[PDB]
Amino acid sequence: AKQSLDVSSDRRKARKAYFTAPSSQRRVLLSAPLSKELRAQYGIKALPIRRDDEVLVVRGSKKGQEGKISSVYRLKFAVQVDKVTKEKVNGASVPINLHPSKLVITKLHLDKDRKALIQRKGGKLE
Amino acid sequence: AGVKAYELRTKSKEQLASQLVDLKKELAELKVQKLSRPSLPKIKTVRKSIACVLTVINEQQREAVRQLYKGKKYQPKDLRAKKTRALRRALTKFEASQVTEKQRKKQIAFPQRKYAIKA
Amino acid sequence: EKAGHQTSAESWGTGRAVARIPRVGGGGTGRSGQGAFGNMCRGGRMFAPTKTWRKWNVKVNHNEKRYATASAIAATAVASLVLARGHRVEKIPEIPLVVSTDLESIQKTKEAVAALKAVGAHSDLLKVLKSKKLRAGKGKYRNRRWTQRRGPLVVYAEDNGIVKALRNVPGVETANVASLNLLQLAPGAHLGRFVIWTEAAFTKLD
Amino acid sequence: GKGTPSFGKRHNKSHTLCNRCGRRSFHVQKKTCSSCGYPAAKTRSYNWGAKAKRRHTTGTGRMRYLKHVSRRFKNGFQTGSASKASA
Amino acid sequence: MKKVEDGNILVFQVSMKANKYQIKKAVKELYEVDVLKVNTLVRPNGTKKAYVRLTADYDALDIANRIGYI
Amino acid sequence: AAQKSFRIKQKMAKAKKQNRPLPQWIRLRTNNTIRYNAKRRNWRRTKMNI
């Protein structure tokens, strides 16, 4: 249960704070879990998704498919994978929007900062 | 592109004045160009650039005056702390801690003693 | 207290072929001319607007109060009552079910469940947990989203970790003997909570 | 003639635009705004006109400066600039 | 455009805050040209137009695709 | 009113600009909800009162 006097269980307040969260806040909300492999690799559970990352969909219809994240469409709380697309009837193609809680991260994109984030959570890196 | 402040700040007063002119000529040209063209977002970055240059020129002149007024009664009202209008005319710490010759004597001889019940 | 009444609407009087509620004035907007104030009016003030100074709490004589909690404590014996109350106590050794004082010292959730299990609470724990439901109400809109039954109630004489090792498990509540509470001894005013007493607590009773 | 044939003669403003409140309640011959009270130093308003007050109190405009006083208070009216850190 | 071809006139949208002197000096300083006289007017989109007649020594058409428009 | 104050002309001009249909590209924005300009005025349906 909640125990801090500065945390609200209130449903209404939660839904507001989700839907009106600033871009920077959405980055963290949009985390994906690392793959079984990467979790042993880095001793770390999950990470804010980020662009050129490599990813495996593991729920829904596109369950099984994989690719490079080509947008973190924060506005939409959604993520696009360059390789997972709808081809409409007029031959045009169009991205599917996927949720990072429903992906798994199979290859990270590394920075000084990415690495720093991992060390900050007490992980380890190759 | 877009000029960086931390680079503007190393330039001379007159270098900055000239880049200001340079950007202004730039902008003028771009606006001619704009009305012959379906869009022109380049134009944004140069008016932003002028902004920044002026910002920087202004910084340095203020920072100049600020020091040649440091440690003086009386310095221009807009380098004086903003604070709040009330806050500004509240007694200073000095004129407030003020204490009567008689009473200072009192405070000294009979101040709140530290004590405890038990034994 | 101002709702219904933020208008300067007047009656129109009779002789205009039209009911005599007050009516909003001016024009050019369609609010103009409409029933005002009255409780049968769209946008009226309600009939007898509710007021904060309604009686919310209730005094009960301290002695009658204790009569009750005593009665409730008494009934946590009486297996029929405990059975009738929900509470899955056919497979328990005996009632009153008194367990070792060693309980009050358990720090860990997982250990707490283990003890409760061993001493007989297994089905009742499972009855909560099996019973979570979305509340049928609008209650659901209002911080009252889920529902569930009431599990065992663990009384102790001295909390040395037990209240925190049990606090996260569905439907289990803990009480200090010194207190003891009618709301917990007879939920919804039905007698017969399943109570697991620590010895320490059991003898402090007297 | 008191009805419409006399409505035809309505072509002169009693009121124009009021510099202080923009409202078109500046009475020309009286030289005073029927809404905001200009040019009286004080601003017209009345306790029997609450809906009126509501339509004009602070906060129905930009609060160009009062906006920020809260934040400023919270950081204890600090002065200077912020420093720097790493990564 | 036609006034440029035919009337040796440059048309600029100009600051509302600016007068005939200021328009004349700026066109003079910004374009190397000599100005005969400057008519102005306020447009109905709330912006100001300057009809700027250059002296007979300058040819506004030439001068308009120096600044770079056509 | 055929020979006007700047102040009035200025207002008039601000009114000319505000008189246009909704910019259609807005309709396509994520979460956009504006169908049509709901504040369009017309000289022969609603007077400015200056």
Place this chain on the structure above:
RNA sequence: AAACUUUCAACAACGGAUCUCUUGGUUCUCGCAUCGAUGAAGAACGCAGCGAAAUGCGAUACGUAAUGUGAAUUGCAGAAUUCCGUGAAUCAUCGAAUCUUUGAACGCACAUUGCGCCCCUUGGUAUUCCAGGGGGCAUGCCUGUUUGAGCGUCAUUU
């Protein structure tokens, strides 16, 4: 016997009840003390590559500087130099600025983008006329500075 009228049903209309929803309202409770002549609250007009509004901002105009984050923004277009980085962002924070015309509103006016005075400076052959740039001039009151007024009044000259 049709048509017509009426009743019932099915499908189709008209209309928006009902059910389910809820970034809103309402009420309670707890913590806190900060508007303004250093120009407030409020007004007006403006500012985006492509905006009418709402939101933001002021000719540095949906923003400049600073700091934290660590790669977006996204309706389209766009830059492309910004991705192991003094660094993305319609991000957060915010300590530095910019802040048009106004408003207690302060050179005088104001149904006027109306009309003076002073200073420094530039240009026109210019202390004097004109034009450009910058900086100034409201009221009551207090302490002080200076210049004064009154046979109100003291001394002092020769």
Place this chain on the structure above:
RNA sequence: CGUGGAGGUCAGUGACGAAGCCUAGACCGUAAGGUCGGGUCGAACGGCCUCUAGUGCAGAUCUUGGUGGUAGUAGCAAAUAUUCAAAUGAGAACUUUGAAGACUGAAGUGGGGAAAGGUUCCACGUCAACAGCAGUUGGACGUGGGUUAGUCGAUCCUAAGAGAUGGGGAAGCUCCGUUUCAAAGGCCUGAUUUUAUGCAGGCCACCAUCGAAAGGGAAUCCGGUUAAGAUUCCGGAACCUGG
């Protein structure tokens, strides 16, 4: 008996279809109502013991919204008046052009303006709504263009009147007074040849300011020119004011 919400319970029902809605189909109850089937539907809901109330509608010339009969009905009848053909267009009584017949009859249905409007002006495109038939037309809709001044106005002056200021009333918002019981100010040049403007004369005591786009008032005319501006642009010829 029935509704919204609350404590308890049935480890109740449910995406293999909750709730709701429809159904001269079934069943229980004297009745309030309850139950089932079938169809529709799409996410939640119910029995039992209790708690609680913003708890049950046919009426209130009830409130708000919606809908009928009336009814394809009353009507669309003032301002003399229309007609032939062509062109255009999916479409022409109604648009454009030509012809004809008329009208207003300079006290205008002509040519301009003041107040007021505010883009309606003009071009191109163009008919969903609007113009109580129509529409290819428009003061409509869409996209653009357009208003040029030393001399025309404003600006200056004063009118009825308004209204600051020293003041006097008034608890006060404010009321009075306007040259008033006020120490009410600025010009012309001379004095400077440290120098820039201090004092030397003599005046002048007039003591705010707003208030007229018809009153007063310095100065511009003709010809040409635009889709739409012109005593404002172009050509030419003048005149006033300051310096």
Place this chain on the structure above:
RNA sequence: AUAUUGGCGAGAGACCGAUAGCGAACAAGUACAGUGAUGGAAAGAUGAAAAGAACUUUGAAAAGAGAGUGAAAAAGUACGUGAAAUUGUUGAAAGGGAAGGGCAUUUGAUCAGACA
């Protein structure tokens, strides 16, 4: 120690659930009215995702018919469900200056149960 329908920041409710709740859940003190003081609304919901219907065909066009998307168009930017008044069609029936109702049976249509 007391007050507090204002301001800033928080945590809540046996509160209201779009004619309710603040007037405003929305570009709401907006649009619109009024010379002015003032007065002052209506208006939330496709779907998980626009996948917002390529293409053919009739049409001047709007659209229709096919096709197509979708778990569903019995969700088509008139959009969840989609009552009633009231309306079109279809089917059945009755009707000599209203219609509807009660007890009862004929006729027609329809249906439950119980039997072994």
